[PDB]
Symmetry: D2
Subunit: 149 residues, 4 copies
């Protein structure tokens, strides 16, 4: 059972948890958004071959978007976003409202979802986001990260 | 030259940089504070023997404080705080204003320094803060972290 | 691109190289043998689900064998074997003649293949064999290992 | 308590154990030898400054030798040697009789001590020997290694 530095879990305890696990790297990210982040599934790299992980999609009719990294020369060097409860979707607990990624090549994938609530930002100076972990219900209640060299 | 996952660097580009490096674990943290964090030096564990790292002290007449962890049964599981520019000490760039630690034993070392500015929080679910990195001038301009299993 | 401590490469430069990569752990090992080791393919654990890696089989009509580890309570704690050139199969370079595994549960999978040539033994005191690397032609010319915590 | 992949422990159970721990790298190695290896102490690199670890010296009047690596451009890429019991020094258990190092720059520090007994060889394809572990009595009964990226 090898283990991987797991960091954070930003967001609330709502929805059901999920942990896609560790892989060799990240190739593509797919997420839906509107006033908050809804669906979130990612395509990892498993030793050279692309491996699509579990789909954590939500029913909310949100705008979808694909984030294609120019792997393996380009990789996430920063993950930041906003977390706060959502009124329209009657649930008392916090939800990831906004998410925004930044790659080592200078490419930043603009903030998806409203930018309001308490801020969180993970600047990676040395290391690789090798996998995602998080909780999903009708939206993305929380999101976590696996890292390695 | 062996390397360690390095994360963050929360705060501004002011002052001079410093990186204390990687060690086996953390035993004691010493920092001075008032409206922001000033001095910051830590005592690591180098294979069982306590090893005091470089002192990054500031002249500002601030209130000092020692944080003694009950090593190795107790270790930091969360580091959070605030970063924002400081008026009184004329400098245009952001500074770590507040810092607050939480150990796996439930012990939280209350927020030191004013809690205003943009928030940052590093929840550690699996891994160890094995070393600090950061920038100091008259205060603690920024602070970073080294992690490992 | 998430790298993993890679060790050894015991054996000769004959045949074609191959690297199955890193995974979460090892579940089953399949190898054929006679006077030396011929086919060698393994089934890894990818975050809980069994993942069969590339088949590196050889044509030689050798006796096959499956090594099923009681994962995840049981794992390899030692890999040792013999390397030396082979007469019968006219090739001037060394080949892994014998291979023998030992698990943390005391189970040792007896030496497969003749035990002659120069000896090699990797005792693992702390760490996990998380993936194999090696060269195959008509037999297993050499074998390597990926490790992680 | 951060941990490091620890490998091997080649040699016998004689003498008293010792573990110098993990450091940033290796700068110099000092060992004494004759028909077997006697004294063995090393100077590590602790984040840039040379750090001398525990001296594991033996009284046997052996020939001493210093191995200075051109750190950090040069580092051990292979450690091999011989282990077998020693007659002259009446002890029934195995002892490391010979030890030989090879650096990434092509420099090989010739076999020290008689080359007889069972062979052991650790080729490092990716990773760093970051610390030694071993057992010493009147000679070097066994030797182990800590590795990391
Ligand atoms: C209102 O319903 C769903 O979505 C919210 C936020 O995603 C969760 O907290 C909740 O448990 C349900 O899964
Ligand atoms: C005003 O002087 C000092 O302290 C501030 C904040 O610590 C730094 O930005 C600056 O460069 C100096 O080191
Ligand atoms: C004789 O043929 C094959 O097998 C040997 C040993 O496996 C290799 O060295 C060689 O290149 C071929 O692949
Ligand atoms: C004969 O005396 C010493 O040295 C040998 C080999 O080093 C050890 O096995 C033994 O316990 C003593 O420490």
């Amino acid at each position: 059972a090898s283990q991987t530095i797991t960091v954070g879990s930003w967001g609330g305890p709502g929805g059901n948890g999920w942990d896609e696990g560790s892989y060799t790297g990240i190739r593509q990210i797919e997420l839906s958004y509107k006033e908050a982040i809804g669906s979130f599934s990612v395509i990892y790299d498993l030793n050279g071959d692309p491996f699509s992980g579990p789909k954590h999609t939500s029913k909310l009719p949100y705008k979808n978007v694909k984030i294609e990294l120019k792997f393996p020369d380009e990789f996430l060097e920063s993950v930041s976003g906003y977390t706060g409860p959502f009124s329209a979707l009657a649930t008392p607990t916090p939800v990831v409202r906004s998410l925004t990624f930044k790659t080592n090549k200078g490419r930043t994938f603009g903030p998806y979802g409203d930018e309001e609530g308490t801020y969180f930002n993970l600047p990676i100076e040395n290391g690789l986001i090798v996998g995602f972990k998080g909780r999903t219900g009708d939206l993305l209640d929380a999101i976590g990260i696996h890292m390695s060299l």
